[PDB]
Amino acid sequence: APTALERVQKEGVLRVITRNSPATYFQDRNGETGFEYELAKRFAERLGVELKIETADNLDDLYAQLSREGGPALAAAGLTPGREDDASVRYSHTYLDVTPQIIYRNGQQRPTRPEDLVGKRIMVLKGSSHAEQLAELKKQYPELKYEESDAVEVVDLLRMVDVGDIDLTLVDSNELAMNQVYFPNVRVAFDFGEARGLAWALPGGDDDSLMNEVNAFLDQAKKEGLLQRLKDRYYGHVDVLGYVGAYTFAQHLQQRLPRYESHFKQSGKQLDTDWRLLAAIGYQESLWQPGATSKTGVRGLMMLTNRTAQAMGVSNRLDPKQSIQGGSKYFVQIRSELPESIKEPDRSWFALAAYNIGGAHLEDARKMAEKEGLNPNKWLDVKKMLPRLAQKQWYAKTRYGYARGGETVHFVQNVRRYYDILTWVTQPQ
């Protein structure tokens, strides 16, 4: 009889079940994203098969699907293995350590240990390891009360805390980091339990043909730095922006962006470009503040120089609509002017670089890349060269000389992250 691996290879497709959420798998007009989506896509490529994503609305359904006749090959969904073995399911080697955290609302008193969870309105996801944690606690503190939802995602639980619908929830630290940027009031109360490893889940039984390939792949993903890169993209917001930076973005998202969103959308539509990337530029430049001012005379929401403003037909840099339109037009123009050899998505990142440092200094970095045997059409390569423009040992012999290339790297990195954050916004219940 055909093995699990042989079935997949024969069918030419790897069916992967997951949750529908930015952390795992998420659809947006510009494509599909998610930590689990990208990791599973790489695994399917390793196997030389097509990835087919299936989703479940809660964990019970996810595990039921995995254990059904005709079910998917594996589940990739930020799964925490249960405390006890169950014949219905087997787990891979773990690929991410996360820490469960009790989450509370700033403005209310912070519980600091498990006993403080008594007397609170708590909600967690049904069928979760988090629910098990509380069930175990309830044996010690019978007055403990908590509710379980089988019809929402973690973003919804965190929103409930943010607006005061509940007092507390319990989530994985990576989920908190990803969502901190949406909820200005949520805070970590304390770490509840030891860190644990997330793992892919396979059907029960004694067929190890696919499992061994999964584990070989995960080890390779770790070695290549793929796990780290995905971790940083999806779960790195607090690591990179800082914790205060993260919940401060959340405040600005709630209070400032609604004042300007229509302008960004208007400009994006007329320029045929994603408004959320435009908005991300605006956040990095001014934190969405139309009266902002840099040290060097640059002003406004999109931080246009007077030269750029004039060139774009901006007559008032301090007017949010004009700044947005001018900055957006400029970004689009310089993206269009990039060498044809630079392809998307890299092309957009090079355009961000040029927005900040100008096309001339950017060309110097591309020339440097080529000289170093790197690919001048790949952003990740040229990004390595940009900081050299701030160092005399490198910039003195370049055509255009000194430039703050380190700043530019930071600029592009931050805008790309804010762009992701805006793309991953979901609607409340």
Ligand SMILES: CC(=O)N[C@H]1[C@H](O[C@H]2C[C@@H](C(=O)NCCS(=O)(=O)O)[NH2+][C@@H]2CO)O[C@H](CO)[C@@H](OS(=O)(=O)O)[C@@H]1O
């Ligand atoms: C939107 C805009 O006006 N960008 C201009 C950019 O300003 C940057 C400058 C930066 C800035 O002022 N950073 C702060 C420096 S400091 O903290 O005040 O010292 N912010 C602006 C947009 O990202 O400088 C470059 C390079 O000269 C210009 O390229 S060039 O015309 O081809 O030379 C580019 O036009």
Ligand SMILES: CC(=O)N[C@@H]1[C@@H](O[C@H](C)C(=O)O)[C@H](O[C@@H]2O[C@H](CO)[C@@H](O)[C@H](O)[C@H]2NC(C)=O)[C@@H](CO)O[C@H]1O
């Ligand atoms: C140290 C730091 O974090 N500074 C931030 C500042 O960036 C400066 C230039 C820096 O990193 O040294 C940043 O200000 C904007 O930075 C972008 C480039 O990333 C510039 O193009 C803008 O002109 C700058 N705007 C202003 C008003 O200075 C701001 C917020 O993004 O935060 C600073 O803490």
Ligand SMILES: [Cl-]
């Ligand atoms: Cl999420």
Ligand SMILES: [Cl-]
């Ligand atoms: Cl620099």
Ligand SMILES: [Cl-]
């Ligand atoms: Cl980057």
Ligand SMILES: [Mg+2]
């Ligand atoms: Mg749902």
Ligand SMILES: [Mg+2]
């Ligand atoms: Mg999980």
Ligand SMILES: [Mg+2]
């Ligand atoms: Mg210069």
